Amino acid sequence: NERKKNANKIKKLEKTLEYSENAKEFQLYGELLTANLYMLKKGDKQAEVI
């Protein structure tokens, strides 16, 4: 049990894990806005980026 049990629960961990990262996307762009922190409005959605 404990062998197969936790083998199952831990491949299950991995299975559930692979999906979401959602961090460096928008991290690098927060850095971009910090860089271009002089062309901004508080009232926009879009950006222009390099």
What lies within 8 Å, CB to CB, of 33 at 6+ separation is: 40, 47
Specify the residue, 30 or 43, whose C-beta has the smaller distance to RNA.
Answer: 30
| Token duo for residue 7 | 């083998």
Residues in contact with RNA, shown as a per-residue x/- string from 7 to 46 under the rule CB under 7 A = --------------------x---x--x------------
> Quick check: 46 and 29 in contact, CB under 8 A?
no
Specify the residue, 9 or 24, whose C-beta has the smaller distance to RNA.
Answer: 24
Given the rule CB under 7 A, which residues bind RNA?
27, 31, 34
